[PDB]
């Protein structure tokens, strides 16, 4: 046994100037389950599909939409255990910020710290980059925020976006459906419709997970609320 990891980078520059490992992590993301984020005028909705491979799976056991703080929520597309690592790190970073400043971390600050961690894994010794893309929602200063953080460590602010399978078509659908001044209920309907575009089979209140962020904070929708929204559609 020897606990020393490799000290050389596994992500290096190709002769054409590209870091191919990050592009392959992006391919892993593009093979993931569809995720949608929509920033309404008074909140953000994050909707993902969780279609289990069997009825033997307990749907309630694992969650893909996760709280980071009382005001920040997370969802991902890509590889789930990498996502768990990043969720744990984001919660710890938010807590450290709260310990220093005694106010909840602004969404942009937490996005920056998480993206910094992802960049570290694009450059440090003996590791591969994370194989996930994160959608991060938050409410700060009476304002909703929606960010996407990629495996390279680059983050973007979005009004509405999609990740995972069929995300190009999802983006086209969003940009031909999204408008400003939208309310949170209509954004929830639009997010569920965007999931429905790429969904295969019947969508039920257990096939999808929905989280919302507004002034009251971030919370996961119970399957009963999701069933009500699906009935409305």
């Amino acid at each position: 046994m020897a606990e020393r990891g490799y000290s050389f980078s596994l992500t290096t520059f190709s002769p054409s100037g590209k870091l191919v490992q990050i592009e392959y992590a992006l391919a892993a993301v593009a093979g993931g389950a569809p995720s949608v984020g929509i920033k309404a005028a008074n909140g953000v909705v994050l909707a993902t599909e969780k279609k289990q491979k069997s009825i033997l799976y307990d749907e309630r056991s694992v969650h893909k939409v996760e709280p980071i703080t009382k005001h920040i929520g997370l969802v991902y597309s890509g590889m789930g255990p990498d996502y768990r690592v990043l969720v744990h790190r984001a919660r710890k970073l938010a807590q450290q910020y709260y310990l220093v400043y005694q106010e909840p971390i602004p969404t942009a600050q937490l996005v920056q710290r998480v993206a910094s961690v992802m960049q570290e894994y694009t450059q440090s010794g003996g590791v591969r980059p994370f194989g996930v893309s994160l959608l991060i929602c938050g409410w700060n200063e009476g304002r909703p925020y929606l960010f996407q953080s990629d495996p390279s460590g680059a983050y973007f602010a979005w009004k509405a976006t999609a990740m995972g399978k069929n995300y190009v078509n999802g983006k086209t659908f969003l940009e031909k459906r999204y408008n400003e001044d939208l309310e949170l209920e209509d954004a929830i309907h639009t997010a569920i419709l965007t999931l429905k575009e790429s969904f295969e089979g019947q969508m039920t209140e257990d096939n999808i997970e929905v989280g919302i962020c507004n002034e009251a904070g971030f919370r996961r929708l119970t399957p009963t609320e999701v069933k009500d929204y699906l009935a409305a559609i």
């Binding site: 310990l99 220093v100 400043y101 005694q102 106010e103 602004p106 942009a108 600050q109």
Partner: protein
Amino acid sequence: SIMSYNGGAVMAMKGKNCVAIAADRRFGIQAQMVTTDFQKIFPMGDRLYIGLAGLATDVQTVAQRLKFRLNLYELKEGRQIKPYTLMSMVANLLYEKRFGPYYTEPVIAGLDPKTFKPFICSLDLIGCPMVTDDFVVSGTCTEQMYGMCESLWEPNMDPEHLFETISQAMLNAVDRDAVSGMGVIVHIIEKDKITTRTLKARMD
């Protein structure tokens, strides 16, 4: 004993929509005066000031390290720090030295950015914050300052009444302390302007 090595006195006071912060100006070593224009009140924003009493070396060190951290904060976040956040940052800085403490007791006076609600607070040398609604004092003549402020302070003072109140409190308190004085500087922070004044004071 250590906190009294250089002397010094700082006071902050709350007005209706304004704050006041005042400090003595003497720098001295034990009984000997060295200078009479030592800076104890540092701006940490457009409408936010911190006054430091205690060891002069720790006054300067803490002001500079706080400026370090505040500049980094305001570059990472494209906003000005709020007074409560500044108080928390100061408390964290002081508590990092829990067993090797800086010998300063900060006082913070400011207006909320985008809200302009007056905020005052004081911290002990290891960073225990105390927010009040009337006044905070720090330094070597806190008993005299407490007498003056408890007698003279009134709620909802306009900036001119606030200036007179904090001026009289500081002047009569430092007139009764051996190692403070040699002039008083007062800052009045309103939402639209900052007024800095030096008071006519005894020089003995």
